[PDB]
Amino acid sequence: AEPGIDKLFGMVDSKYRLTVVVAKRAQQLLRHGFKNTVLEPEERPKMQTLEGLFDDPNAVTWAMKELLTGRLVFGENLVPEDRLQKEMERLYPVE
Amino acid sequence: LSQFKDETNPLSSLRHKRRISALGPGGLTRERAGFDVRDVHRTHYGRICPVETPEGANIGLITSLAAYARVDELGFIRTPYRRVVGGVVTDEVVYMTATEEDRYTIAQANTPLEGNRIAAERVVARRKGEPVIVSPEEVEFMDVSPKQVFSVNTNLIPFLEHDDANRALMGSNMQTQAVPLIRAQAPVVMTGLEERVVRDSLAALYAEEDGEVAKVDGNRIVVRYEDGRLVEYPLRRFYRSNQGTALDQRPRVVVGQRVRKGDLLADGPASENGFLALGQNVLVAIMPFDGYNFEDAIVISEELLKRDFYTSIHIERYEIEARDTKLGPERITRDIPHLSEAALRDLDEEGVVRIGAEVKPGDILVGRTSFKGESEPTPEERLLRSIFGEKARDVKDTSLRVPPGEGGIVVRTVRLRRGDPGVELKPGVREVVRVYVAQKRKLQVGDKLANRHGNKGVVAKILPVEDMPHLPDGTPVDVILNPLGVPSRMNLGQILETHLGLAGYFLGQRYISPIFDGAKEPEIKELLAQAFEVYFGKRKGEGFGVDKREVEVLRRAEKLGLVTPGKTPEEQLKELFLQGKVVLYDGRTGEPIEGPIVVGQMFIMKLYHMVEDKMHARSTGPYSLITQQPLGGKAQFGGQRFGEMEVWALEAYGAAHTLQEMLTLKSDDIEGRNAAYEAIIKGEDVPEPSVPESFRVLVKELQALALDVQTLDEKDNPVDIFEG
Amino acid sequence: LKAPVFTVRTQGREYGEFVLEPLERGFGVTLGNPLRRILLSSIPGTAVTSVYIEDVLHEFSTIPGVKEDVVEIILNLKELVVRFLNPSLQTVTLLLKAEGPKEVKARDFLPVADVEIMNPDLHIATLEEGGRLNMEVRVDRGVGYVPAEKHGIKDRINAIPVDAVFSPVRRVAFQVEDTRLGQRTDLDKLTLRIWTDGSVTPLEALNQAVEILREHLTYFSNPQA
Amino acid sequence: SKLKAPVFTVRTQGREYGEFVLEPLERGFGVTLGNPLRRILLSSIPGTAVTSVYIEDVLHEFSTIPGVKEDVVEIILNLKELVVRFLNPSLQTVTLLLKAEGPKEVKARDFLPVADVEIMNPDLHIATLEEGGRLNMEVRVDRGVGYVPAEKHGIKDRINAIPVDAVFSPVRRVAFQVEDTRLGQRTDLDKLTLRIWTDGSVTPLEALNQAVEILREHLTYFSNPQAAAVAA
Amino acid sequence: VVGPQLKLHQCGLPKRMALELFKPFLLKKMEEKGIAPNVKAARRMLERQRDIKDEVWDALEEVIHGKVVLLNRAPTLHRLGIQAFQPVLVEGQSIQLHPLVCEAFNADFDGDQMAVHVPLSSFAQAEARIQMLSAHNLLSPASGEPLAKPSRDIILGLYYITQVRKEKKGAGLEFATPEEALAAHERGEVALNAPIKVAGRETSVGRLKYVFANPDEALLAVAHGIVDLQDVVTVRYMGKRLETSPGRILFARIVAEAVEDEKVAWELIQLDVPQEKNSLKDLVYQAFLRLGMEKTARLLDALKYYGFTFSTTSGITIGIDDAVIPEEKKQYLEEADRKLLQIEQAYEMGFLTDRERYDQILQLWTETTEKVTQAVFKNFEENYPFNPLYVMAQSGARGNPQQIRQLCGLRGLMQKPSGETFEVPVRSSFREGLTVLEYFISSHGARKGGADTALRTADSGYLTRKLVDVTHEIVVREADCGTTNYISVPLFQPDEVTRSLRLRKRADIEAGLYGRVLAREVEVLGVRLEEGRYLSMDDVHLLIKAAEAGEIQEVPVRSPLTCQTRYGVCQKCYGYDLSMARPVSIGEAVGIVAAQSIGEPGTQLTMGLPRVIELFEARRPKAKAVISEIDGVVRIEETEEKLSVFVESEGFSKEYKLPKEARLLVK
Amino acid sequence: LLMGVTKSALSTKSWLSAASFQNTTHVLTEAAIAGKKDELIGLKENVILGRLIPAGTGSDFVRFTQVVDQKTLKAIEEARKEAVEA
Ligand SMILES: [Zn+2]
Numbered sequence A: 001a002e003p004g005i006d007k008l009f010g011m012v013d014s015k016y017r018l019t020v021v022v023a024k025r026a027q028q029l030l031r032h033g034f035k036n037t038v039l040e041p042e043e044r045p046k047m048q049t050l051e052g053l054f055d056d057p058n059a060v061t062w063a064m065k066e067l068l069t070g071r072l073v074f075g076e077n078l079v080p081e082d083r084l085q086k087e088m089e090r091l092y093p094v095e
Numbered sequence B: 001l002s003q004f005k006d007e008t009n010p011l012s013s014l015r016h017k018r019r020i021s022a023l024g025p026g027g028l029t030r031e032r033a034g035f036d037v038r039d040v041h042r043t044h045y046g047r048i049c050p051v052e053t054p055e056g057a058n059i060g061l062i063t064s065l066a067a068y069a070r071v072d073e074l075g076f077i078r079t080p081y082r083r084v085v086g087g088v089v090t091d092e093v094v095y096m097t098a099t100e101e102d103r104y105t106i107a108q109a110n111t112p113l114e115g116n117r118i119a120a121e122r123v124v125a126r127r128k129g130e131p132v133i134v135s136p137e138e139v140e141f142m143d144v145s146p147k148q149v150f151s152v153n154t155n156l157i158p159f160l161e162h163d164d165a166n167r168a169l170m171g172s173n174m175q176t177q178a179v180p181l182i183r184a185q186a187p188v189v190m191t192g193l194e195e196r197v198v199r200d201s202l203a204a205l206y207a208e209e210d211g212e213v214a215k216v217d218g219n220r221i222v223v224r225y226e227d228g229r230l231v232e233y234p235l236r237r238f239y240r241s242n243q244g245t246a247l248d249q250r251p252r253v254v255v256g257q258r259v260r261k262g263d264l265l266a267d268g269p270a271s272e273n274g275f276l277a278l279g280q281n282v283l284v285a286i287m288p289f290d291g292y293n294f295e296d297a298i299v300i301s302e303e304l305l306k307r308d309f310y311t312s313i314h315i316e317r318y319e320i321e322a323r324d325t326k327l328g329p330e331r332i333t334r335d336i337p338h339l340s341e342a343a344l345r346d347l348d349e350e351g352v353v354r355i356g357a358e359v360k361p362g363d364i365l366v367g368r369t370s371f372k373g374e375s376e377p378t379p380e381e382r383l384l385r386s387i388f389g390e391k392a393r394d395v396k397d398t399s400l401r402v403p404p405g406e407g408g409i410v411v412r413t414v415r416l417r418r419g420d421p422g423v424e425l426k427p428g429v430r431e432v433v434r435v436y437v438a439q440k441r442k443l444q445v446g447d448k449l450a451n452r453h454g455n456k457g458v459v460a461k462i463l464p465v466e467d468m469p470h471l472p473d474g475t476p477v478d479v480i481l482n483p484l485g486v487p488s489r490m491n492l493g494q495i496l497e498t499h500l501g502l503a504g505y506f507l508g509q510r511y512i513s514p515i516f517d518g519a520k521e522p523e524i525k526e527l528l529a530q531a532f533e534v535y536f537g538k539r540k541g542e543g544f545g546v547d548k549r550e551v552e553v554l555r556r557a558e559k560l561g562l563v564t565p566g567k568t569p570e571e572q573l574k575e576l577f578l579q580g581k582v583v584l585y586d587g588r589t590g591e592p593i594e595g596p597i598v599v600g601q602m603f604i605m606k607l608y609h610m611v612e613d614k615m616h617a618r619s620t621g622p623y624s625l626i627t628q629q630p631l632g633g634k635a636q637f638g639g640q641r642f643g644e645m646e647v648w649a650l651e652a653y654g655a656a657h658t659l660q661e662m663l664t665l666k667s668d669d670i671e672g673r674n675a676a677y678e679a680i681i682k683g684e685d686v687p688e689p690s691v692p693e694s695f696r697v698l699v700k701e702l703q704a705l706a707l708d709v710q711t712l713d714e715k716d717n718p719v720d721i722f723e724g
Numbered sequence C: 001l002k003a004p005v006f007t008v009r010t011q012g013r014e015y016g017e018f019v020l021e022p023l024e025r026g027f028g029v030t031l032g033n034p035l036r037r038i039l040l041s042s043i044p045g046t047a048v049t050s051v052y053i054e055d056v057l058h059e060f061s062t063i064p065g066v067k068e069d070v071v072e073i074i075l076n077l078k079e080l081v082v083r084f085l086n087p088s089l090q091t092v093t094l095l096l097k098a099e100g101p102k103e104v105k106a107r108d109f110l111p112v113a114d115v116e117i118m119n120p121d122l123h124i125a126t127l128e129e130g131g132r133l134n135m136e137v138r139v140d141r142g143v144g145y146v147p148a149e150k151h152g153i154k155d156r157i158n159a160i161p162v163d164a165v166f167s168p169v170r171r172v173a174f175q176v177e178d179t180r181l182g183q184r185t186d187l188d189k190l191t192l193r194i195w196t197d198g199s200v201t202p203l204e205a206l207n208q209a210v211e212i213l214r215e216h217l218t219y220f221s222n223p224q225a
Numbered sequence D: 001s002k003l004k005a006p007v008f009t010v011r012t013q014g015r016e017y018g019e020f021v022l023e024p025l026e027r028g029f030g031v032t033l034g035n036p037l038r039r040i041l042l043s044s045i046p047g048t049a050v051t052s053v054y055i056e057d058v059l060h061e062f063s064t065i066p067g068v069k070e071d072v073v074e075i076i077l078n079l080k081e082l083v084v085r086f087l088n089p090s091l092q093t094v095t096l097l098l099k100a101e102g103p104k105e106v107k108a109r110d111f112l113p114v115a116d117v118e119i120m121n122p123d124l125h126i127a128t129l130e131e132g133g134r135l136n137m138e139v140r141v142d143r144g145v146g147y148v149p150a151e152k153h154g155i156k157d158r159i160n161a162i163p164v165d166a167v168f169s170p171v172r173r174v175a176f177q178v179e180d181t182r183l184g185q186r187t188d189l190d191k192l193t194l195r196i197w198t199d200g201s202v203t204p205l206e207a208l209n210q211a212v213e214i215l216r217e218h219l220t221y222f223s224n225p226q227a228a229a230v231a232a
Numbered sequence E: 001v002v003g004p005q006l007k008l009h010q011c012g013l014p015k016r017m018a019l020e021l022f023k024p025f026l027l028k029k030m031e032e033k034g035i036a037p038n039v040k041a042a043r044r045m046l047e048r049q050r051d052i053k054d055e056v057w058d059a060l061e062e063v064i065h066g067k068v069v070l071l072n073r074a075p076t077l078h079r080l081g082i083q084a085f086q087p088v089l090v091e092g093q094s095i096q097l098h099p100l101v102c103e104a105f106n107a108d109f110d111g112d113q114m115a116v117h118v119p120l121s122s123f124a125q126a127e128a129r130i131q132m133l134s135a136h137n138l139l140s141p142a143s144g145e146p147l148a149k150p151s152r153d154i155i156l157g158l159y160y161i162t163q164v165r166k167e168k169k170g171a172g173l174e175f176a177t178p179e180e181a182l183a184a185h186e187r188g189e190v191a192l193n194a195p196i197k198v199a200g201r202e203t204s205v206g207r208l209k210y211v212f213a214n215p216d217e218a219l220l221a222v223a224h225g226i227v228d229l230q231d232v233v234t235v236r237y238m239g240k241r242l243e244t245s246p247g248r249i250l251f252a253r254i255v256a257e258a259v260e261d262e263k264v265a266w267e268l269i270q271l272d273v274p275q276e277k278n279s280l281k282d283l284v285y286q287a288f289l290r291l292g293m294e295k296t297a298r299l300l301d302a303l304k305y306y307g308f309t310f311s312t313t314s315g316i317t318i319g320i321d322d323a324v325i326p327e328e329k330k331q332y333l334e335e336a337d338r339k340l341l342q343i344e345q346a347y348e349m350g351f352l353t354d355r356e357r358y359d360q361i362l363q364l365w366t367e368t369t370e371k372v373t374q375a376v377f378k379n380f381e382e383n384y385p386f387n388p389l390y391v392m393a394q395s396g397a398r399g400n401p402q403q404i405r406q407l408c409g410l411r412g413l414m415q416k417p418s419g420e421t422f423e424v425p426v427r428s429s430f431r432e433g434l435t436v437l438e439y440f441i442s443s444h445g446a447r448k449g450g451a452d453t454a455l456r457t458a459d460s461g462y463l464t465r466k467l468v469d470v471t472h473e474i475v476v477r478e479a480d481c482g483t484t485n486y487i488s489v490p491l492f493q494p495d496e497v498t499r500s501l502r503l504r505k506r507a508d509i510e511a512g513l514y515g516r517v518l519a520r521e522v523e524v525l526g527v528r529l530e531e532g533r534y535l536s537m538d539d540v541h542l543l544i545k546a547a548e549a550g551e552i553q554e555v556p557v558r559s560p561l562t563c564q565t566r567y568g569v570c571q572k573c574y575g576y577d578l579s580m581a582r583p584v585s586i587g588e589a590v591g592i593v594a595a596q597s598i599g600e601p602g603t604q605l606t607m608g609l610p611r612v613i614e615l616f617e618a619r620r621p622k623a624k625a626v627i628s629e630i631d632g633v634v635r636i637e638e639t640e641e642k643l644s645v646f647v648e649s650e651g652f653s654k655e656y657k658l659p660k661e662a663r664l665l666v667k
Numbered sequence F: 001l002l003m004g005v006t007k008s009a010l011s012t013k014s015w016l017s018a019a020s021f022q023n024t025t026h027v028l029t030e031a032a033i034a035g036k037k038d039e040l041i042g043l044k045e046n047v048i049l050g051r052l053i054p055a056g057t058g059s060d061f062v063r064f065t066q067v068v069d070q071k072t073l074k075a076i077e078e079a080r081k082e083a084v085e086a
Helices: A005-011 A015-031 A059-067 A081-091 B010-016 B165-176 B194-200 B303-307 B378-387 B493-507 B521-535 B537-541 B548-560 B569-578 B644-652 B656-663 B670-682 B693-703 C027-041 C070-077 C202-217 D029-043 D072-080 D204-219 E015-021 E023-032 E039-045 E054-064 E122-130 E152-161 E180-189 E205-209 E215-223 E246-258 E262-267 E277-291 E294-313 E328-348 E354-383 E388-394 E401-408 E436-457 E462-471 E506-513 E537-548 E590-604 E609-616 F005-010 F024-033 F043-048 F070-077
Strands: A072-075 B077-085 B088-096 B123-126 B131-134 B211-216 B220-225 B230-234 B264-267 B280-286 B298-301 B312-321 B364-366 B368-371 B395-397 B409-416 B432-441 B448-451 B457-463 B479-481 B597-606 C005-011 C015-023 C044-053 C082-084 C091-098 C102-105 C115-117 C123-127 C133-143 C169-178 C188-196 D007-013 D017-025 D046-055 D084-086 D093-100 D104-107 D117-119 D125-129 D135-145 D171-183 D186-198 E010-014 E069-072 E082-090 E115-117 E233-236 E241-244 E476-478 E487-490 E554-558 E633-636 E644-648 E653-657 F066-069
Touching: A005 A015, A005 A059, A015 A059, A015 A072, A015 E122, A015 F066, A059 A072, A059 E122, A072 F070, A081 F066, A081 F070, B010 B165, B010 B194, B165 B448, B165 E436, B220 B264, B280 B493, B298 B303, B312 B364, B364 B432, B479 B597, B493 B521, B493 B597, B521 B537, B521 B569, B548 B569, B548 C169, B644 B656, B644 E082, B644 E462, B644 E590, B656 E122, B670 B693, B670 E023, C005 C202, C015 C027, C015 C202, C027 C169, C027 C188, C027 C202, C027 D029, C027 D204, C044 C070, C044 C082, C070 C123, C082 C091, C091 C102, C091 C115, C123 C133, C188 C202, C202 D029, C202 D204, D007 D204, D017 D029, D017 D171, D017 D204, D029 D171, D029 D186, D029 D204, D046 D072, D046 D084, D072 D125, D093 D104, D171 E215, D186 D204, E010 E015, E010 E069, E015 E023, E015 E054, E015 E082, E023 E039, E023 E054, E054 E082, E152 E246, E152 E277, E152 E294, E152 E388, E180 E205, E205 E233, E215 E233, E215 E246, E233 E246, E241 E246, E246 E262, E246 E294, E277 E294, E328 E354, E354 E388, E354 E401, E388 E401, E462 E590, E462 E609, E462 F005, E487 E506, E506 E537, F066 F070
Parallel strands: B280 B479, B298 B457, E010 E082
Antiparallel strands: A072 F066, B077 B088, B123 B131, B211 B220, B220 B230, B280 B597, B298 B479, B312 B432, B368 B395, B409 B432, B448 B457, B448 B597, C005 C015, C015 C188, C044 C133, C082 C115, C091 C133, C102 C123, C169 C188, D007 D017, D017 D186, D046 D135, D084 D117, D093 D135, D104 D125, D171 D186, E069 E082, E069 E115, E233 E241, E487 E554, E633 E644, E644 E653
């Protein structure tokens, strides 16, 4: 199957909540550049024909790595929605 | 009750002309009622096949009439029987009404004889419907042959006696779907009717009297009869069928060859030298393989494609009109405006693609140019026509192009031009032009194959000859059938065809096992014993004894109880041969299969379900007008329909976004899909709405009737859903 | 420590038995199958690749005076086996031109500089009175099975590419027979058996076969990441 | 076809286990190379193994030994797992001696040392001696190839000795999988990858290389022809 | 096309197809790289088929990486009719489907086509492979059974290696006592008397002869052809001298290597018996409970691989001689002949009425047929245990004993189209000549079955629509509803043979209890089953063993019938069946799930099905039975035409008119 | 009150779902008079409109979920620090 799904289902009260977390993390992990990541020092997803997944093949897979460590926080009403978007763009360039 | 000639092959059209429908255009029987209407009744005995009916909705409704059955002066089906005088059977036959049948004692055709006498005091015979056991005196009539019970197709299955009725109709209906093969072949084990089918269907061409042959083209045959006639028979050269198959004739005689009346001059489309050739005789090994012949899949030796056995020609037909229009007349010409010189290299000076040129999907077949739409604008343009060199208007490209899917090489054209020399061109039709394109279509993974016994199967893997089971001599098998398709489907007849085909392969002979007067097991065995003294009698002499692998299998064989121990390997291998099975070595390890395996010749054929009609792939393309969901066209296919049940599927998962895509960005919501594809070229994620198309339309479309439909917030409050 | 006796038995160009004896327990399979699997595929040879007929412009044609359609002539042309007598020729265009009442054999091709048609009695076509057959077939050298649709070889615009069965190896069988020799019973008499069309002899093929294998073992030369 | 020279990548971990991948190969050579090599690795790879044992006062393979926890069978089973290496190809056989008493776990080191013999397996559990338990034994290690059962070889040292199954092949298991890999326009290329397990005498790589070297050398056997022909 | 080399993870689909599906994506990737300056050049490169360069393909597969597509097949009966896979570029023009999910979609490979859809959003993609990926939907939502279980060849392989032989103990080779049987019965074994695997009561000579220390040794022995996989030898695996076969310890390691935990792997297998779809079904289910989801995935592919690989080499075909007619057939038919001749004169003398003769002929052949059925499997089981027919039949591979009896014994009693079965039965089997009449006799019922299958294809989701229309409301919206209500699931059923008590069958209780929530704490056998835990499968089996010793007869379990949260159901009240084995996640569209899982099996309800309609629509029955309006006492009458019953209490009475045919229940 | 499947189905609170049966004019009219509101309760109702599924992902219990990296998490801590005036 997919790496450590059992661990991801356990992370969430709702099966479907995992999906939304993964998706919404994937979206920002594409939108505000790709440097949004929490895990990019050493061994993070890779590909073939070179080794080249360190920039931008599969954002959703990335999110599943990232969520597989305690680095990310997920929850109902964490931060006001609007300063969420203002602070993300403001902190990271690539536009 | 009129319908296109099902002429896939000779047998296909013959079955079709001999159908019987219950759904009359006057309103006889309708699709709702079934239960007792469809069942087989005692009277169908000898009159209507209990097998021929098709699967699905039309069971029992459409059913073909028996072989010997025929219709008398009134619309009654009338089967033959022959009279028996006390206990003496006559050579005199009476076709009997269904009701008239019931007046008498009719005995069964498998009843022993001595010239004219019954033999067994204990006789099988039918009174009206019931199965009755009877004495020789009581017998009043007897059947003519077991063939008079079933249809023509059902009567081409050789060991039907060993086949379940259910998978027997699948054999019967599939022979219809047999596609004519260029390297066509008659079955290694026939029933007998296979020269009578290519007679009565006029596929082939037979000498009218005794005489000699004077000329043989591939185009025509010419013969000199006794009566003095010299007749010229022209051949059907490469005629297209109604469903794409290639129906041509091939001359099978030489100049100076004498012939007898009724002798064959040319084979039909699926005729091998006077025999019905629906498929080919392959060397089949029936055994599992590395999950490649799963459920009903098939595995193929690449030797078939090399030998080009499973190749079949197919010809499509493309057509355009040079219609006449308000804008001005359209013209079949070569100078199309916005075309690269490379795109015209194969069009003749008139714009028609030249004969013998390979055409790929998107090339030009016939060039057509039509004037720019929206009209002839009289007030201003009419002056320009006199000002500027008249006929210097504008003309666009409306040619004909090989559709998605494919074509082949152009083989024939047809111009029906004005000055109409015997043609009925429609009003406003100026000319019409046709181009025929052809394809040698080899067997490919995905095509469909089946025997006569009802064994559906798609080719799932084409192994190279190197790595697939072979005999001790380096002969590989050709087809690998999974034995897990035999027990559920009670059709042991294919197993006998294999055994009898195994003996016929080393004896160099073919067999006719009449339908119910068939080959019995002892007969088959002794032909196999006759075979093995050639399969192996020779290998002793060439200097080769038994293989260390052959003895390792005979070890497990006697442990499995297939050979009786203590004998010599030779006597055991012959015991093991007679049971149809032989030692088989995996071709990729050279290690023997650890038990014996039955192989032989089986008659297998190529069905009308190939993979050119079948595969489609749509990214983007045309969209309809009143409904915006999409459709195929210039170089684009249509979408697949995502039905209501497929909506219940995604609802049963959490695929809320996936489902809305299916209903919004896929084809229906214009703003949504445009944003969806533009954002894909960006590298972005696709945003859902916005608002959905269905929601805004259902408002205004309700709004067309005087219904005030508002949209509300969480607290009841007005929400404008039209985006400012 | 054995040194197996390698006896050879030849029957013309077609059939050849190669015996290797005595071998270690179960090496009949270990040597006689990977050579089988190589003889069948990677042995090179010759095959007809493209044809062009007088007045014929596609494979789906009929030629007046000729019994066989252009398709049956092509099917008859795949059996043409041709030896190159000089391993510098990659291609030879054979020409056949015949008329009158004749059974055109493969014999009837015109002779070429260094080419031997191994197949002289192969039946090409049957021509009646006034039948004209004029054509140019091209044989190339290649390896394996390559359809007409993959290579698309055409000299002239009317040519019709033909499927290419290069491998000049018909069937291959090996026999592992028990040979007592001296001390031991369970020794293998690996004798493997080779049929070929004449373009290359069975011996010629076996030697290229072991040499293909040998060369494949050298691929475990140097390890990497 | 030449410039597709197959890359031979190797993952190696110690001296027991090693995966060896060879890619890309021409259609259907993954099996053509992997199975003739596995058939070589399992049989004709050379080595050593215990072939016969003699116990102090034990007269059948089935007996039970007072003062010893293990049945005579599980000791010989423990001896089959003993891996040893001769360091000088003049030793044709070594009879190892084991003598120990009292309560002790006799290890494979408790054999007495011999001049050119390396026990690769010093911590092997041979036997558990109880109070007053006397164990006195001589086992025979021979050189051989493959797996050879007890009744085939029938090795004799003393009249009370018991021949033991011989696991010569210093190769524990070998399995290969031939996978499809893609190079450009072709999907149907073979990616031969084989696993090799060994007892420590030789590393997996050394075994594979000795294996290909046996095969190579066997191809050289089609070089001394003769003459005949068959017909009747 | 079957894709046996695909992972359950995966599916294969052609190149030209993948290129067109992701064409807009691909254009971008050719613009990522030096392949094209901009999309307008990227478009022109991909029009015609001969042009696609090697580097273009590298970009396509690079676009695909990780992304899944959805596959669909025609009658979308339950939700697993659509599953997601990763695409794999394959040669050819067909989609390639993993064999383990030919279960979910009712697909075999005889021409069936499938659909293939791309999900576009990161959202659409996420939910496609968190929820819809095939390698996550291993257990059906209808019953907690596993649905991605070994099919046709996988079973047939794993059983053929996990099996044992028996042989000629011609002389009663007793080893249990004699030590002279140690060597000297092996004397006779290495002489011409005893076979390597026969009854020696404690051991077979094989057990003694070969005794392996490694399993690695054991198969190294097998590789050298001294023992087969289904011979019995002694092996020491995990500190125990196991007398077993190398095949069955091989199987063990196969499971043991798939899931990294050798120790669990040993513990959740039963290597003392051959492997058949049920045992493998339980193994798949046990593995997913104890070891997780993705390990069970790797387990299934592994089972699929050795199952396939051992299937081919084991060499099992169907020759005509493999359908062996027992000697018992001609014997039983001779009896059957004579006893039918007895019936003929007993009727011809006037002792048997014309009816009682008929009933007694049918009684005969129905007995004769069932007798020769068991007389076939007696032959197989005692003389040819490895017969392919018999192996396929008793494994989960392929075969119904109903079917086998028709190839080897005889097809039994056919029916008239009316419903009266014929007097003469079909004496022949398929292995020998079936006569012309016996075949025309047979076709009468042959089409009535083909027709009944046709009249269920006509309206496929008919049941499912109406249940969807009733239930689409129903979702899981709350963690719980405060309701202290519940349903008592009865473990016994009263009136069957009498008005007594009786344990409901195993499946039934199991179907009503697996994965619910206790409503109350239940202390039974030193076990406090605390209120509001999700009782598991083992839990349910304990309550069966509990009520088997009569300690309870009902259970408090929270149910949807007694849920309170309005427009859906709460987590607790509903059961414990997502596709997984874990509790229901909030937002599970249980409504459609319940509809499909009821409607899909409706395709297997003969015409049964009308009954099911008759319950779902509150409707009047045909032979309706009166219920008692009052709880009272029974009294019956014997009136000439028409009886009646009074139901009476100390307070008041009520009479119920009873027609003459109406047979009652209460004495 | 016990009713059969179709009857229970054909009688719903929502008119959107009701318009999916065979006499739509009657239910459109009956609801247009009483100014009926259609709470987007069920699936069928919510699919006639092109609007998202109220299950799975579209469950209001899950729809509004937020995710933050620990780097930008503490970056909101500083959105309340400049709220102190002067
Ligand atoms: Zn509830």
